[PDB]
Every structure is written in structure tokens, then in C-alpha cells.
Design a protein around this nucleic acid. Structure first.
Lengths: 639, 36, 86
DNA sequence: CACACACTCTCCAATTCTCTAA
């Protein structure tokens, strides 16, 4: 510790706003790099230098005020890349035991401190200036001296963008400048964003395509494409009025719930006694039920009034969504909208072609196709949002991208089912693949709507290819029949249901418009026998699982759920599959909802199926027993 | 039954045909026009 | 001690389905246009039967357990028997 | 002293994971 303190002191000192470097900075920095290279597996030197805050106190001032001293600048850049190395790379994984996890948290804390320090525009200004005067030279004029410096500069930017938000300070409310927002603003004011656009659009500097893709991914980490595309000049009044209206809506909901609870309990204090015998209700024994919880509770009596819920065991605990969404700063949102627009118009086709070339040549790291699929989803969604132009994404519209995404999704599906010790990670990768697939399937619909007969022709071509090949049809059933709430989040379930709805919409409209009978060595096909594959218990079980959150679901998601269930019930006559006790409890909640008028479609469907059930029950009383279990072909025996 | 063959081969043509699009990549320009 | 379980053999075919066959012999449903209150009556009767069967759990926990029990030999054999005669 | 509370540890068995047959 003390030897590190000595070298850290030997770096120099700050005075007011000017840093006075010692002449032995070079050897002291080399010694620091040597200590970091000879670290323990606990990363003790990492923790100690982070605690000493030399990155904030010495290296940033040296970088910002002595950037003409090129050997010292290069040494400082290498040292800063080493220090800003992400914790997952430092330790290899998230440790499973307390001591290494404490060390991981320490390194992560100091990384968050570095990210806080790096929001200064001066540092990114120096980085942009040195990268600019480097890239001014021709590619053939570069040597290892400059190519390695480009690598270290871009890796420093990547490392600083990668850092997770502190759990302490991630409680920022919407429309506020988080640390990531301030960092993006630093990039914007320094002009490194324009250098990233240049690197993406350059044919000569295509060697950095994977790096630039990772920078752009970490830049647009938090954003949503349609929400970002909706940003514009008049947003302040819109968002202010929306905030006031949403505040009043929340308040009215809370007042309604308070009034309902005040009615459920009486207007007498709890120690006001009184006991009743409910003569008809047998207790757990043969004696009549004695009720003690007040007369007010017997209007909506239930036996679970006083019961403690059960501990879901660790294995059965459902997966939860990893982050809340927050509306970032308006300046940063405008900057990211402009970045995304200019990038889409000037850079996107060449960058995606370069990344696909890298993946084909197999000179990319293990999971860089996840970044490729992210970029597909984000930028095609942004393109369709606002002024849709398929020329801006025509490199992505090929059937080869459908094939690549389908292969990746099936690979992630297999690896999720087999590599069980990181099944959640494989599920997240599969979620990225699913969103990319969804955006392709949405883009062909937008091509159909668009007026150009050329894009309509190619839309017909790709639709014919996809609906002809079997895997695109079978993948949805494959996903539904092995989806697990234990592993995959409800956001994934939402995306799967909406993608299935869109896919069946397109397929039904296609077959309705024209026959096109042969499919898959070909065989005949029809959409009704395809839909009969969705009559399995598991898929409808997943659909009602998503339906349980109808209060929190989006209106489009609720429409997708109810339309699929209405297709299975009304058009395929499979109401006995959906005659279930848990589903009936959900219908009971739907009918008892005070906001049931807001869910007119759902309650109407519920009353339709309930009326069918009670007709069957009046005809035959064994339907009550049939409610208790999921079923296979009892769906026809009941009929 | 030959309508089945006609449909199959016409669909084969309609999937083997190339993807005509308004593909375009805009003007190349040096880093000065980007940065400043 | 004999800690109880909601399993396939203690009670589900002993105080469970055989009684559930009889629970709705005296029910009072009124049909189309009254599905809401018909469902409320149905849920109350099902909840009461489940409580008298296994009183340790809440109703939805009981449902999520019994749906898993629907895969077991005794349960489906009793289900087919109840479908057929008695 | 001694009779109730408050807290920890251990064992037991009930549930879920894995591999196999109907």
C-alpha cells in the first residue's frame, strides 16, 4: 500500500486548476502498470488505486493538460484502459462466494467513480482531438504505433460507457441527467460522436467496425426507438401536461382503493367484538363456521382472509425485469435522436455489412452477433418510426438476415435448455434475437403499406420465402412449448406474444389474399391446420400468464392476448381448453375490477366463454371437476 | 391437377427472383465535414 | 406428527374429487346475462371445498399445486372414473 | 432460585432435479 502511495505521490499534484507533473512521471507510471500486471486475483492494486483516486486526481489532469508529451500520454492512456477494465473482465464472472463478491463490488464502485469523473468535456475533447489528428493520416501511413493507439482510445471510451449505473444513484427520476446522460453530453460537446459517424461510414477504416458498433450499442443502451423517434421541438409542453394528468390519474386510483378498503372494514374499532355462526358453511370439521372478523367482511367473505401467503421456493421464484425505464434528459434525447438519424442515413448500411463480414470471417469475439441483432432491432425500429425509407436499411432486408437471426435464436434456445448454469443469460441473448426477428416482420408490413411498387415486389418475394420455409413457422411453437416463467421475464413473454400476433396476422392475410398451396420435397398447407398447433395447453397457459398482468399490460398487448384467445375459442371451437379454474379466478378479478369499463374487449370475451361454460355446466355437472386440471383431448370429450 | 405444378413453379420463381429495392448509400465526405 | 401434504394420495381423491362431484348438486346458477354473479358463486363454492380439503394454503396456491397434481396416476385415473360412472 | 420469552442450530422429510420407460 505504502509503495503505491509513494508512486502516486510521485505523479505530481494539482494547484487550483493546473497540474504540475514531476519529471519521473514516466517511470512511476510504468511502475503502476507493473503493479497492475502483477495484481493478485483479488485485484488488490485495482482496489487501492481506486481508493487513492489517482485516476481522478492525476491521470485525468495529466491527460488534459500534458497531452503534447506523447510518451507520457500513451502510458497514461494504457494505464487508464487497464484501470477502467470492466469488473466482469477483471474477475471472469460474478463470484458465488462473499469475499470475491465484496472485491467485485469494490472494483465496481471505483469504476462508477471513474464514470462520474469522466463527464468532464475536456477529457473527451482531448480524446477527440488526438483521434482526429491521428485519423487525418492515411491508412497506409499508419503503423502499429498509431493503430494500437486507436485501439486503446476506443477501448477507453468503450470501458467508460460500459460501466453499470450505481445502485445507490440509479434512483434518479425521469427527465434528469444521470451519469450516463452527462457522459453522452460530454461526447456530444467534444464531437467524438461525429468521429464515430466518420469511423462507421469510412470504407478505409472498416477495421474498427466491431468497436464502433459496441460504442453505439453502449451509447443507446437505455433508449427505446419509437419513444426516441417521437422527440422534437414541442415536447416540453406535452411532457409537462402529461405529467400533471398522470399525477391526477394515480391520485384518483389511490383514492378509489382507499374508499373500497374503508368500506371493506367497518366504522367500528377493531376491538369492538361480536361473533357469528354462518349456519350453512361447514367448518374444516363438521361444525358450522364461527366468524370473528366482523360483519362487514361477510359481504365478500373468503376463507383466505387471515392466511399468510406461501414462500415461493428459490427454484420456483419467477424471473423479474432487470431495470425500470426512465425518461432521460431532453437535451440528451434530442442529441441521440439526431445521432440516430444521421447514423441511419450515412453509416448504417456500411457498418452492418462490415459487421456481417467480420462474423462471416470469424474475426469477432464470442457473442458479437448480439450487438449485430441489437443494431437491427434499434435502427430498423427507428427507421419505421418517423420517415420510413427502406433504402436506409436495405442491407438488412435480405432473407439471409432472417436465416441468420433464426439460426441464432434456435442456437440460444438450445443453449438455454442445455447450459443451465447461465440459462438467464442465454434467455437475454434469445430475447435480443426475438426483437430483431420481430422488427424484420414489422418492416415487411411497412413495406406493404409504403407506395413503392418495387418495395412491394421485394416484400412479396421475402414473404414468399419466409412463409415457404418451415423453421420460421415452427419456431413460435418451439418457443411456446418450452418457455419458462422461472427463467424468462414477462417482457420476453410480451414480445413473444406480440411477435406471434403479427406473424399470424401476416400469414392469415397472405393465405386469404392468394392460395400459394405448397410449403416446405414440398407438401400442401393451410392456415387452419397451422393454427391447430396452437391448441396445446402450454401455449394458452403462457397466454393467460401474460393476461394476469392486464392492469399493467399495454393496450396493444391486451389486444394481442384477447385476439389470440378469441381466435382459438370462436373460430376453432376450443373453449374447453380455456375452461380452467385459475383462468376463471383471473376472469373473476376482471369482472370485479372497478376499471372494467377500460377493458371492454377482455370482459366481453370473458363473459362469452363464461356463458358457454355455464351452458355446458347446466347440461352436465362434471364440468366443475373438469375445471380443476389442464387437459389434452378431454377438450373433445367434454364436447 | 397441373394447377398445383403451376402454383409450385410460379412460387419458386417468385422466391428465387432478386430483391429489387431503392438501395442507396449517400455521398462520401472527409472527416472535416463531419467534425467541423 | 404426520405433517400433511396436498399430494396425489392423502386427500385429493378421498375428501377432494368425490366430494367435489357432490358440491354443485344444489347450486343455483341463473345462466346467460348473469355470468358475473354465477362466477362469484362458483368461485365461493370451489374455494370452500378447497379450504375444507387442505386448509393450510390460500386458494390460488392450492390451484397452482393441484394443476401440477393433475399429471399423477391416481388423479387422472379418478378423473376418468368420475367421467365414466362413479 | 424459576417461569416465561428470545434466539440459534440441527435433523428430518418433502419437493424438485435428473434419467428412464410407457
Amino acid at each position: 500500500n505504502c509503495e503505491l502511495l509513494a508512486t502516486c505521490s510521485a505523479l505530481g499534484y494539482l494547484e487550483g486548476d493546473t497540474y504540475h507533473k514531476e519529471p519521473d512521471c514516466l517511470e512511476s507510471v510504468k511502475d503502476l502498470i507493473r503493479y497492475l500486471r502483477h495484481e493478485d486475483e483479488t485485484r488488490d492494486v485495482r482496489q487501492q488505486l481506486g481508493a487513492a483516486q489517482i485516476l481522478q486526481s492525476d491521470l485525468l489532469p495529466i491527460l488534459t493538460q500534458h497531452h503534447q508529451d506523447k510518451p507520457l500520454f500513451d502510458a497514461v492512456i494504457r494505464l487508464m484502459v487497464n484501470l477502467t477494465q470492466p469488473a466482469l473482465l477483471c474477475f471472469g464472472n460474478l463470484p458465488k462466494e462473499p469475499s470475491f463478491r465484496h472485491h467485485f463490488l469494490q472494483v465496481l464502485t471505483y469504476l462508477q467513480a471513474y464514470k462520474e469523473a469522466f463527464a468532464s468535456e475536456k477529457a473527451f475533447g482531448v480524446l477527440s482531438e488526438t483521434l482526429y489528428e491521428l485519423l487525418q493520416l492515411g491508412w497506409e501511413e499508419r503503423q502499429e504505433e498509431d493503430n494500437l493507439l486507436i485501439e486503446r482510445i476506443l477501448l477507453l471510451v468503450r470501458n467508460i460507457l460500459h460501466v453499470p449505473a450505481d445502485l445507490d444513484q440509479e434512483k434518479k427520476i425521469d427527465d434528469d441527467a444521470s451519469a450516463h446522460d452527462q457522459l453522452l453530453w460530454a461526447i456530444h460537446l467534444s464531437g467524438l460522436d461525429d468521429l464515430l459517424l466518420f469511423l462507421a461510414s469510412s470504407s478505409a477504416e472498416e477495421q474498427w467496425s466491431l468497436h464502433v458498433l459496441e460504442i453505439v450499442s453502449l451509447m443507446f443502451r437505455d433508449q427505446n426507438p419509437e419513444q426516441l423517434a417521437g422527440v422534437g421541438q414541442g415536447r416540453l409542453a406535452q411532457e409537462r401536461s402529461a405529467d400533471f394528468a398522470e399525477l391526477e390519474v394515480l391520485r384518483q386510483r389511490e383514492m378509489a382503493e382507499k374508499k373500497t378498503r374503508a368500506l371493506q372494514r367497518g366504522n367500528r374499532h377493531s376491538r369492538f367484538g361480536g361473533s357469528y355462526i354462518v349456519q350453512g358453511l361447514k367448518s374444516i370439521g363438521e361444525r358450522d363456521l364461527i366468524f370473528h372478523k366482523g360483519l362487514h367482511n361477510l359481504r365478500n367473505y373468503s376463507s383466505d382472509l387471515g392466511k399468510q401467503p406461501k414462500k415461493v421456493p428459490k427454484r420456483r421464484q419467477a424471473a423479474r425485469e432487470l431495470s425500470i425505464q426512465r425518461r432521460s434528459a431532453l437535451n440528451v434525447r434530442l442529441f441521440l435522436r439526431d445521432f440516430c438519424s444521421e447514423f441511419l442515413e450515412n453509416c448504417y448500411n456500411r457498418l452492418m455489412g462490415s459487421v456481417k463480414d467480420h462474423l462471416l470471417r470469424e474475426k469477432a469475439q464470442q457473442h458479437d452477433e448480439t450487438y449485430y441483432m441489437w443494431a437491427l432491432a434499434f435502427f430498423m425500429a427507428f427507421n419505421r418510426a418517423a420517415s420510413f425509407r427502406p433504402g436506409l436499411v436495405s442491407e438488412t432486408l435480405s432473407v439471409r438476415t432472417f436465416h441468420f437471426i433464426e439460426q441464432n435464436l434456435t442456437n440460444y434456445y438450445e443453449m438455454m435448455l442445455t447450459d443451465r448454469k447461465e440459462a438467464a443469460s442465454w434467455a437475454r441473448r434469445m430475447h435480443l434475437a426475438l426483437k430483431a426477428y420481430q422488427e424484420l416482420l414489422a418492416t415487411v408490413n411497412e413495406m406493404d403499406i409504403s407506395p413503392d411498387e418495387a418495395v412491394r415486389e421485394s416484400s412479396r418475394i421475402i414473404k414468399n420465402n419466409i412463409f415457404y420455409v418451415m423453421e420460421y413457422r415452427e419456431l413460435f411453437l418451439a418457443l411456446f412449448r418450452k418457455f419458462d416463467e422461472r427463467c424468462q421475464p414477462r417482457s420476453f413473454l410480451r414480445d413473444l406474444v406480440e411477435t406471434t400476433h403479427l406473424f399470424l396476422k401476416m400469414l392469415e392475410r397472405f393465405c386469404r389474399s392468394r392460395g400459394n398451396l405448397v410449403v416446405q420435397s414440398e407438401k400442401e398447407f393451410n392456415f387452419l391446420d397451422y393454427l391447430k398447433r396452437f391448441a396445446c395447453s402450454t401455449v394458452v397457459r403462457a397466454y393467460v400468464l401474460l393476461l394476469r398482468s392486464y392492469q399493467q399490460n399495454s393496450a396493444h398487448t391486451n389486444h394481442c392476448i384477447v385476439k389470440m384467445l378469441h381466435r382459438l375459442a370462436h373460430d376453432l371451437k376450443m373453449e374447453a381448453l380455456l375452461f380452467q379454474l385459475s383462468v376463471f379466478c383471473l376472469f373473476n378479478r376482471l369482472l370485479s375490477d372497478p376499471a372494467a369499463g377500460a377493458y371492454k374487449e377482455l370482459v366481453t370475451f370473458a363473459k362469452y366463454i363464461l356463458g358457454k361454460f355455464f351452458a355446458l355446466a347446466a347440461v352436465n355437472q362434471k364440468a366443475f371437476v373438469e375445471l380443476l386440471f389442464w387437459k389434452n383431448t378431454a377438450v373433445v370429450r367434454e364436447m | 391437377e397441373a394447377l398445383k405444378q403451376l402454383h409450385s413453379e410460379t412460387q419458386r420463381l417468385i422466391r428465387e427472383s432478386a430483391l429489387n429495392l431503392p438501395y442507396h448509400m449517400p455521398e462520401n465526405k472527409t472527416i472535416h465535414d463531419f467534425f467541423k | 406428527r404426520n405433517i400433511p401434504k396436498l399430494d396425489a394420495q392423502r386427500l385429493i381423491s378421498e375428501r377432494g374429487l368425490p366430494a367435489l362431484r357432490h358440491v354443485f348438486d344444489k347450486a343455483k346458477f341463473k345462466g346467460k346475462g348473469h355470468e358475473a354473479e354465477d362466477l362469484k358463486m362458483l368461485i365461493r363454492h370451489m374455494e370452500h371445498w378447497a379450504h375444507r380439503l387442505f386448509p393450510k394454503l390460500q386458494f390460488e396456491d392450492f390451484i397452482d399445486r393441484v394443476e401440477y397434481l393433475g399429471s399423477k396416476k391416481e388423479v387422472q385415473t379418478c378423473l376418468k372414473r368420475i367421467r365414466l360412472d362413479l
